[PDB]
Amino acid sequence: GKLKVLGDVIEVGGKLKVLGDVIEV
Amino acid sequence: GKLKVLGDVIEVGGKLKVLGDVIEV
Amino acid sequence: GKLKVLGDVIEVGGKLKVLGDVIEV
Amino acid sequence: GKLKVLGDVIEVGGKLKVLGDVIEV
Amino acid sequence: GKLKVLGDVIEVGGKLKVLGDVIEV
Amino acid sequence: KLKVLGDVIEVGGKLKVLGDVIEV
């Protein structure tokens, strides 16, 4: 029911960024 | 062996934001 | 000390995605 | 832990309608 | 002057949706 | 793009929606 996030940590231009999806759990 | 993200969706100033933890999977 | 995530929920092609930054807290 | 609505404004037969999903935040 | 939304929550394919009206208040 | 982030509220046993139109 609640909206959660599942993502990956990626290195972009030397900085750590996050790309993920919103999931229902 | 890789860095993943597990988080929660939160409402901040009318916008949907994410607060999460970096985990090793 | 710990790696946390601060991000935004964005609507991309009708799906809810997350873009965020890894931060040290 | 509240029910929210995330939606788009669409023009249907000259009237403005909202098409959205109920989410738990 | 402002655009507001009023609608009913409907169950479509097991998901809760809204097909609401946009009204000027 | 015109969007809405409104609230779902229980009004006499039925779920209703109230919100504001925002530009995103």
Side-chain angles (χ1 to χ4, degrees), chain A, chain B, chain C, chain D, chain E residues 1-10 12-25, chain F:
Chain A
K2 294 86 96 289
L3 290 188
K4 295 243 174 195
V5 175
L6 187 69
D8 287 275
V9 170
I10 295 131
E11 194 162 88
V12 187
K15 283 181 71 191
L16 297 180
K17 297 268 171 185
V18 177
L19 174 55
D21 298 292
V22 168
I23 58 168
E24 198 184 314
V25 18
Chain B
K2 56 166 186 175
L3 295 175
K4 294 208 120 231
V5 174
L6 243 205
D8 292 277
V9 173
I10 55 161
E11 197 193 358
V12 185
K15 285 192 289 170
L16 295 182
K17 297 265 177 178
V18 173
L19 246 309
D21 301 293
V22 175
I23 56 168
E24 200 201 354
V25 190
Chain C
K2 292 150 76 193
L3 290 187
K4 298 242 174 199
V5 174
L6 222 197
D8 290 275
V9 170
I10 56 253
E11 197 168 80
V12 183
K15 285 185 202 185
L16 298 176
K17 297 268 173 185
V18 176
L19 173 54
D21 299 290
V22 169
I23 58 168
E24 198 184 317
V25 190
Chain D
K2 58 217 191 290
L3 289 181
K4 294 225 76 112
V5 68
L6 189 57
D8 293 281
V9 174
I10 57 166
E11 196 167 82
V12 190
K15 288 191 289 170
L16 296 178
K17 298 265 165 189
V18 174
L19 222 193
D21 302 291
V22 176
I23 56 168
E24 193 186 326
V25 195
Chain E
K2 292 158 76 188
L3 292 180
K4 296 242 171 201
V5 175
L6 215 206
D8 298 290
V9 169
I10 55 163
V12 186
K15 284 180 66 191
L16 297 179
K17 298 265 178 176
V18 180
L19 209 211
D21 297 272
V22 173
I23 46 162
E24 200 183 316
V25 191
Chain F
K1 177 86 253 170
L2 294 181
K3 296 209 133 239
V4 178
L5 186 73
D7 291 279
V8 171
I9 63 280
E10 198 168 81
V11 185
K14 283 180 70 190
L15 298 178
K16 298 267 172 178
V17 176
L18 188 266
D20 301 294
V21 172
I22 58 166
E23 195 170 299
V24 189

Short mmCIF file of all heavy atoms in Angstrom, two decimals, chain B residues 3 5 9 15-22, chain C residues 2-9 18 22-23:
data_model
loop_
_atom_site.label_atom_id
_atom_site.label_comp_id
_atom_site.label_asym_id
_atom_site.label_seq_id
_atom_site.Cartn_x
_atom_site.Cartn_y
_atom_site.Cartn_z
N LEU B 3 26.01 -1.12 -4.76
CA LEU B 3 25.33 -0.17 -3.88
C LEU B 3 23.92 0.11 -4.37
O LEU B 3 23.71 0.55 -5.49
CB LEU B 3 26.14 1.12 -3.73
CG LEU B 3 27.51 1.00 -3.04
CD1 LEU B 3 28.24 2.33 -3.08
CD2 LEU B 3 27.35 0.51 -1.57
N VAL B 5 19.68 1.41 -3.10
CA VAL B 5 18.99 2.39 -2.25
C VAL B 5 17.62 1.88 -1.91
O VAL B 5 16.87 1.45 -2.79
CB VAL B 5 18.91 3.79 -2.92
CG1 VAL B 5 18.06 4.76 -2.09
CG2 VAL B 5 20.31 4.35 -3.16
N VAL B 9 8.96 7.52 0.35
CA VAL B 9 8.43 8.70 -0.31
C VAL B 9 7.75 9.54 0.79
O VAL B 9 6.92 9.02 1.56
CB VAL B 9 7.44 8.35 -1.44
CG1 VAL B 9 6.76 9.62 -2.00
CG2 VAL B 9 8.14 7.56 -2.56
N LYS B 15 5.49 18.78 -2.48
CA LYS B 15 6.20 17.98 -3.47
C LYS B 15 6.53 16.64 -2.86
O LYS B 15 6.72 16.53 -1.65
CB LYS B 15 7.50 18.67 -3.92
CG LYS B 15 7.29 19.85 -4.87
CD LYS B 15 8.58 20.31 -5.52
CE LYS B 15 9.55 21.00 -4.60
NZ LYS B 15 10.86 21.19 -5.27
N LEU B 16 6.64 15.61 -3.70
CA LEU B 16 7.01 14.27 -3.25
C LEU B 16 8.51 14.12 -3.31
O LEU B 16 9.11 14.29 -4.35
CB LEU B 16 6.29 13.20 -4.07
CG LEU B 16 4.77 13.13 -3.94
CD1 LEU B 16 4.24 11.97 -4.79
CD2 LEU B 16 4.30 13.00 -2.45
N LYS B 17 9.12 13.86 -2.17
CA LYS B 17 10.56 13.69 -2.01
C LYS B 17 10.87 12.30 -1.52
O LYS B 17 9.96 11.54 -1.19
CB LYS B 17 11.13 14.73 -1.03
CG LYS B 17 10.97 16.15 -1.51
CD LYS B 17 12.19 16.67 -2.22
CE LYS B 17 11.92 18.05 -2.72
NZ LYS B 17 13.13 18.62 -3.38
N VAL B 18 12.17 11.95 -1.49
CA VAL B 18 12.63 10.65 -1.07
C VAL B 18 13.75 10.79 -0.05
O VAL B 18 14.69 11.58 -0.24
CB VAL B 18 13.10 9.82 -2.32
CG1 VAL B 18 13.75 8.49 -1.90
CG2 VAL B 18 11.93 9.56 -3.28
N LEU B 19 13.66 9.99 1.02
CA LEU B 19 14.71 9.88 2.03
C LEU B 19 15.01 8.38 2.14
O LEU B 19 14.09 7.57 2.23
CB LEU B 19 14.27 10.49 3.37
CG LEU B 19 15.00 11.77 3.88
CD1 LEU B 19 16.54 11.65 3.88
CD2 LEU B 19 14.52 13.01 3.20
N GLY B 20 16.26 8.00 1.99
CA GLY B 20 16.63 6.60 1.99
C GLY B 20 18.02 6.30 2.47
O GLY B 20 18.80 7.20 2.79
N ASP B 21 18.31 5.01 2.54
CA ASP B 21 19.62 4.53 2.97
C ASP B 21 20.30 3.83 1.83
O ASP B 21 19.65 3.20 1.01
CB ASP B 21 19.46 3.54 4.12
CG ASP B 21 18.77 4.09 5.34
OD1 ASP B 21 19.34 4.98 6.00
OD2 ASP B 21 17.68 3.59 5.67
N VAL B 22 21.61 3.93 1.79
CA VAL B 22 22.42 3.19 0.82
C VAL B 22 22.69 1.83 1.47
O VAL B 22 23.06 1.76 2.65
CB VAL B 22 23.72 3.94 0.45
CG1 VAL B 22 24.62 3.09 -0.46
CG2 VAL B 22 23.38 5.29 -0.21
N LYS C 2 27.31 7.96 7.84
CA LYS C 2 26.54 7.03 7.00
C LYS C 2 26.10 7.67 5.69
O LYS C 2 25.85 8.88 5.63
CB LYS C 2 25.28 6.52 7.73
CG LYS C 2 25.55 5.60 8.93
CD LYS C 2 24.46 5.71 10.01
CE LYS C 2 23.17 4.99 9.66
NZ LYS C 2 22.06 5.38 10.58
N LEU C 3 25.98 6.84 4.66
CA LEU C 3 25.53 7.30 3.37
C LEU C 3 24.01 7.22 3.30
O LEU C 3 23.41 6.15 3.48
CB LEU C 3 26.16 6.49 2.24
CG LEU C 3 27.65 6.66 1.95
CD1 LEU C 3 28.02 5.92 0.71
CD2 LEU C 3 28.06 8.14 1.78
N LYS C 4 23.39 8.38 3.09
CA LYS C 4 21.94 8.49 2.98
C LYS C 4 21.60 9.04 1.61
O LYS C 4 22.50 9.42 0.85
CB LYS C 4 21.36 9.33 4.13
CG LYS C 4 21.60 8.71 5.50
CD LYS C 4 20.34 8.34 6.28
CE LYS C 4 20.69 7.62 7.56
NZ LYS C 4 19.54 6.86 8.10
N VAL C 5 20.32 9.06 1.28
CA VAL C 5 19.85 9.55 0.00
C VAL C 5 18.78 10.59 0.18
O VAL C 5 17.87 10.41 0.97
CB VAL C 5 19.36 8.38 -0.88
CG1 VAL C 5 18.72 8.89 -2.18
CG2 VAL C 5 20.51 7.41 -1.18
N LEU C 6 18.89 11.68 -0.58
CA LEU C 6 17.88 12.74 -0.59
C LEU C 6 17.48 12.86 -2.06
O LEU C 6 18.34 13.06 -2.91
CB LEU C 6 18.50 14.06 -0.10
CG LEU C 6 17.70 14.94 0.83
CD1 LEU C 6 18.30 16.35 0.86
CD2 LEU C 6 16.19 14.98 0.46
N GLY C 7 16.22 12.64 -2.36
CA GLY C 7 15.84 12.68 -3.77
C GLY C 7 14.47 13.22 -4.06
O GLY C 7 13.74 13.57 -3.14
N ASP C 8 14.14 13.30 -5.36
CA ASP C 8 12.87 13.82 -5.82
C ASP C 8 12.14 12.74 -6.57
O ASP C 8 12.77 11.96 -7.31
CB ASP C 8 13.07 15.02 -6.75
CG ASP C 8 13.57 16.25 -6.04
OD1 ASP C 8 12.74 17.00 -5.51
OD2 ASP C 8 14.81 16.49 -6.04
N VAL C 9 10.83 12.71 -6.43
CA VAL C 9 9.98 11.82 -7.21
C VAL C 9 9.61 12.61 -8.45
O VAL C 9 9.14 13.74 -8.35
CB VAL C 9 8.72 11.35 -6.43
CG1 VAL C 9 7.75 10.61 -7.35
CG2 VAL C 9 9.11 10.45 -5.28
N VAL C 18 12.76 8.14 -9.45
CA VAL C 18 13.48 8.87 -8.43
C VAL C 18 14.84 9.29 -8.95
O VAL C 18 15.52 8.52 -9.60
CB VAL C 18 13.56 8.03 -7.13
CG1 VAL C 18 14.40 8.74 -6.05
CG2 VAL C 18 12.16 7.75 -6.58
N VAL C 22 23.50 11.06 -3.17
CA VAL C 22 23.98 10.38 -2.00
C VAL C 22 24.60 11.49 -1.12
O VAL C 22 25.28 12.37 -1.64
CB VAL C 22 24.97 9.26 -2.37
CG1 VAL C 22 25.68 8.72 -1.13
CG2 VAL C 22 24.27 8.13 -3.10
N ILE C 23 24.26 11.51 0.15
CA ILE C 23 24.76 12.49 1.11
C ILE C 23 25.35 11.74 2.29
O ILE C 23 24.99 10.59 2.53
CB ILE C 23 23.64 13.51 1.53
CG1 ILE C 23 22.41 12.80 2.15
CG2 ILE C 23 23.23 14.39 0.35
CD1 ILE C 23 21.40 13.66 2.85
#
